[PDB]
Every structure is written in C-alpha cells, then in structure tokens.
A = this chain, B = another copy of it.
Amino acid sequence: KYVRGCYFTNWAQYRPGNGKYNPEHYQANLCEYIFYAFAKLNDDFTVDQFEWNDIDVLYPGVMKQKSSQPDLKVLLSLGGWNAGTATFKKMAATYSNRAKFISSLVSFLQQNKFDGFDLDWEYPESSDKENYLLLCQEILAKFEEVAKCTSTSRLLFTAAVSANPKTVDAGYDVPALAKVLDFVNLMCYDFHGAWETQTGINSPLYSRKEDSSEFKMWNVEQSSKYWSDKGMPKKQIIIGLPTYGRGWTLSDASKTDIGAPAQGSSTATEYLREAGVISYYEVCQKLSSGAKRVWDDESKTPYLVQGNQWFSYDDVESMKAKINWIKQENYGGAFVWTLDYDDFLGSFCTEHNGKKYPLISLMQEILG
C-alpha cells in the first residue's frame, strides 16, 4: 500500500491561455491526497487565505472533486519557499504563540472542510529544532483532542521536509517527529538549478560518477536513505517527484553536456513566465519545435537543449524509473509537485496520443 500525493497551487490560475489550471482540471483517482499550496501565516500568527478567491472559489472547487472520488483527502499546506522563516521562527518560540497559531489553524481547517494540515516550514534551523518538535507535538495533540469531542476520525498531519542531510541534521529531531507526523513529503528536488554557474540535474535518482564528492548525497536514493538512517520508518517517507524542470543559458552553445558552463538562468517561458524554470508541457512544446533531448541513464533523467537554453526536467521515462524504484525499495509512496505542470489537458504533447496527465498518472498505474 502506497501514498499517492499531489500539490495543487493557488497561483496556477494566473497562467495564460491553455496553461491556466482550475480545480476542475483534476482527474478522479490521480491522487489519494491533494495538498493545497498555500495558506498565509499572518504576523500575529493567525491563519488566513493567501489568494483573494481561495475561500470563495478555489477551496470549494477542490472539495468538489470528492464527488467523483469519495476517498479523496484534501490537506491545507502552510509555508513554502517564498514565505521564508521569520514568522515561523517567532510563532514556534513560545507555548502562547504556538497555542494561538494552532487555535487559528484548527478553526480555519474546520470552517473550510479540510482533511488535514501539511506544514511546509522551509526550513527549521538548529535554533528551531526544539521549537519545531514542540509545534508538531502540540498540533497532533490538538487534532486528537478535536477528534475525541465526537469520536470522529482526526485531521491528518504531514510535513514537507528538506532533502539536504546537513539541513536535516540541524533542524529536525527525526525519531521524535516520526511519532507525531503521519508521513513526510521528502523534497528530493531542486538539487541543482540556475543559482549555479553550470548545468546540473534538478532531481537525479542516483548519483553520477562525475558528481563532485560534495554532491554524492544530493539525489533521490541517498536523500531518502538518510531520513531512514536518521530514524524515519520508510513507510512514512514519501518520495517527491517534480513535474517541472530548471534551466540555464549556456555560456557556449556548442557545450551542452551536464556540467556545461552557464552564464545565467534560462529565459522565462511562455506560460510559467519565470526565468530558470519550465513546465513539462512547455518542454513538450519545445520538443515539437525541434529541441534536442538527451536521456542520462546514470541519473535516470532527461535534459533538453534548444540553442543556448538547457533544461534538466522529468518525464515519463524518469517517472517510470523513480516510481518503480519506490516499489523496489519499499518507501512510503510518492507525491508530485505539481498538478499544474503536467500535460493536464492531454493537448500539449503529441507522443502520448492525447493522454491527460502522462506524468502524474504513473503513480496510480505503478503503485495503485
């Protein structure tokens, strides 16, 4: 039995044309859990919607999906990269601060009919290690208290967690968190990207011989193993699968290997409009335009070259390898970041004969 999770994002509504992603684009039985990114943590530690139409439109639209998938669970995620850590740090620092946050959170979850809560603090530091654990222990205790009122099933509680072993060491009490979190969404991606001066793999399954020694742990296999070594049971370790890629502008268009020199991020793409990233469906458009694809069998990922633009990304072949490896190694399951980067219409790519969600469907197909 495997967890299959999927992140919905409340800013994908702003993509133009056929990139615009609405709750109704979800397909029944793709995911057992949808994680809603993101709510907002106010300065006064209360919780509220982040986008103007979360409560009135998008939350109900996502909850609607339970009509064709009765087992679907929808959790609210809080935090993320852009939110930073300053407010989390102060909120977790005292019992009174944490109690105020937990009270606001529980009311927000109940009023909006969520099934659980996904804590995406990116990331707790050494100074936060104790406070982060207390926060998690007190969230679970509250959720249990709420369930005891009526003998109902309790809200779920998960967390998205760093794949960097040094970060894991500093911020997480792993054996203690295993008793309190239902599972952890391992963020084993963004290992390399436009912040570096040479091309590299966003989410390699295995290390490559040409990896420098400092990066030998910076892959799916070793990052997940580290969490297991630190005391997290494998069934609680959920492997993260990106449906986006990261891109560079090459210094030299004749040097296109992994590790080739770069002069900066890739040019912002048509739908994501953000330098240095690309969606899978945008990759399909570039392939139709004649972009060159290379399969890197060592890491089990492809990369794309179009002129001086170079992207590391994930596709059906890399997802197949990774999801089969999840079964083989008996980790807890998979989750995808995000629903809205796949070919969710089936019309952006030609090679899948119009199949919707050619990437994300693989979870149900292989693990289901």
Interface residues of A (CB under 8 A from B): 60, 64, 67, 70, 103, 106-107, 110-111, 146, 149-153
Contacts and interface: CB of A to CB of B under 8 A. Distances in A.
Q: For the complex formed by this chain, how many copies does it contain in all?
A: 2
A156 to B, nearest CB: 16
Contact of A151 (B103, B151, B152, B153): B103
Q: Which A-B residue pairs are the 5 nearest by beta carbons?
A: A149-B149, A110-B150, A107-B151, A64-B67, A110-B152
20 contacts: A64-B67, A67-B67, A103-B151, A106-B150, A106-B151, A107-B150, A107-B151, A107-B152, A110-B150, A110-B151, A110-B152, A111-B150, A111-B151, A111-B152, A111-B153, A146-B149, A146-B150, A146-B151, A149-B149, A149-B150
Contacts of A103: 151
Contacts of A70: 60
Contacts of A106: 150-151
Contacts of A151: 103, 106-107, 110-111, 146
A217 to B, nearest CB: 42
A23 to B, nearest CB: 11
A146 B149 CA distance: 6
Contacts of A152: 107, 110-111
A149 B145 CA distance: 8
Max count, chain B CB within 10 A of own CB: residue among A60, A110, A146, A151:
A151
A64 B64 CA distance: 8
A153 B152 CA distance: 15
A184 B153 CA distance: 31
Contacts of A64: 67
Given A60-B70, A149-B150, 5 more contacts: A107-B152, A110-B151, A110-B152, A111-B153, A146-B150
A55 B153 CA distance: 15
Contacts of A153: 111
A73 to B, nearest CB: 14
Nearest to A24: B67
A103 B151 CA distance: 8
Contacts of A150: 106-107, 110-111, 146, 149-150
A146 B150 CA distance: 5
Contacts of A107: 150-152
Nearest to A112: B152
A60 to B, nearest CB: 6
Nearest to A64: B67
Nearest to A65: B67
A359 B359 CA distance: 50
Nearest to A63: B67
A150 to B, nearest CB: 4
A252 B28 CA distance: 61
A364 to B, nearest CB: 21
A167 to B, nearest CB: 33
A338 B103 CA distance: 41
Most B CB contacts (10 A, CB to CB) among A67, A103, A110 go to: A67
Contacts of A149: 146, 149-150
A60 B69 CA distance: 11
Nearest to A111: B152
A64 B28 CA distance: 14
A62 to B, nearest CB: 11
A150 B103 CA distance: 8
A151 B110 CA distance: 7
A150 B153 CA distance: 12
